[PDB]
Amino acid sequence: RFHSFSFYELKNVTNNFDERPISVGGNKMGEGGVVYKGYVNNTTVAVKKLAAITTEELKQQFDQEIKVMAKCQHENLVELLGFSSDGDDLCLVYVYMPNGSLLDRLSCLDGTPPLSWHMRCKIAQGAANGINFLHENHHIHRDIKSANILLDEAFTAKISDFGLARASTVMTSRIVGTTAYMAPEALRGEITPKSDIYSFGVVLLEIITGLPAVDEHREPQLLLDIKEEIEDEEKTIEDYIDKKMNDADSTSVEAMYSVASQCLHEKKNKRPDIKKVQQLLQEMTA
Ligand SMILES: CC(C)Nc1cc(Nc2ncncc2F)ncc1C(=O)NC[C@@H](F)C(C)(C)O
DSSP assignment of the chain equals --EE--HHHHHHHTTTT--SBGGGT-SEEE---EEEEEEETTEEEEEEE-----HHHHHHHHHHHHHHHHH---TTB--EEEEE-STT--EEEEE--TT-BHHHHHHTGGGPPPPPHHHHHHHHHHHHHHHHHHHHTTEE-S---GGGEEE-TT--EEE---TT-EE--EE-SS--S-GGG--HHHHTTEE-HHHHHHHHHHHHHHHHH---SB-TTSSSSBHHHHHHHHHTTSS-GGGTS-TT-SS--HHHHHHHHHHHHHHT-SSGGGSPPHHHHHHHHHHHH-
CA distance 138 to 269: 18
Closest CA to 199 of 148, 254, 133, 243: 148
Strands 91-95 and 80-84: antiparallel
For residue 220, is the peptide bond before it cis, meaning its omega torsion is within 30 degrees of 0?
A: yes
Show the ligand 1 pocket: residues with CB < 6 angstroms: 22, 29-30, 35, 46, 48, 78, 94, 96-101, 104, 110, 112, 150, 160
Kindly list the domain boundaries of the chain, sorted by start residue: 2-96, 97-286
The angle subtended at Cα 275 by Cα 272 and Cα 279, nearest 5°, is 90
Closest CA to 169 of 203, 129, 140: 140
The reply to whether 143 belongs to the active site is yes
CA distance 193 to 185: 11
Q: Cβ(130)–Cβ(152) under 8 Å?
A: no
Is 214 annotated to bind a ligand? Reply is: no
Which residues make beta-bridge pairs with 49? 34, 91
CA of 20 to the centre of ligand 1 (A): 15
Closest CA to 115 of 274, 256, 244: 244
Burial class (CB in 10 A: 0-12, 13-18, 19+), 83: buried
Q: Pick the atom of ligand 1 nearest to 35's CA.
A: 1
Q: How many CB atoms lie within 10 A of CB 255?
A: 18
CA distance 267 to 155: 33
Note the maximum CA span of the chain.
58
Domains 2-96 and 97-286 share a fold: no
At the fourth CATH level, the homologous superfamily of domain 2-96 is Phosphorylase Kinase; domain 1 (3.30.200.20)
CA distance 229 to 232: 5
Q: Pick the atom of ligand 1 nearest to 48's CA.
A: 11
* Amino acid identity at 29: M
Q: Cβ(159)–Cβ(78) under 8 Å?
A: yes
Sheet holding 34-40, edge to edge: 3-4, 80-84, 91-95, 43-49, 34-40, 28-30
CA distance 264 to 105: 23
CA of 282 to the centre of ligand 1 (A): 27
* Amino acid identity at 82: G
CA of 149 to the centre of ligand 1 (A): 10
Query: Which residues does 213 contact at the CB level (< 8 Å), separation at least 6?
Result: 145, 146, 178, 180, 181, 202, 205, 206, 222, 223, 224
Is 35 annotated to bind a ligand? Reply is: yes
Q: What is the resolution of this structure in A?
A: 1.9
CA distance 137 to 75: 15
CA distance 152 to 57: 30
Q: Cβ(212)–Cβ(84) under 8 Å?
A: no
- Of 19, 27, 28, 35, the one to substitute when testing ligand 1's pocket (max ligand atoms within 8 A of C-beta) is 35
CA distance 72 to 162: 10
Closest CA to 96 of 144, 27, 146, 145: 27
Residue 181 main-chain phi, psi, to 5 deg: -110, -15
**Catalytic one among 104, 143, 196, 242?**
143
CA of 1 to the centre of ligand 1 (A): 23
97-286 placed in CATH 3.90.1150.10? no
CA distance 190 to 131: 19
Closest CA to 278 of 134, 155, 161, 71: 134
Is 6 annotated to bind a ligand? Reply is: no
CA distance 170 to 229: 32
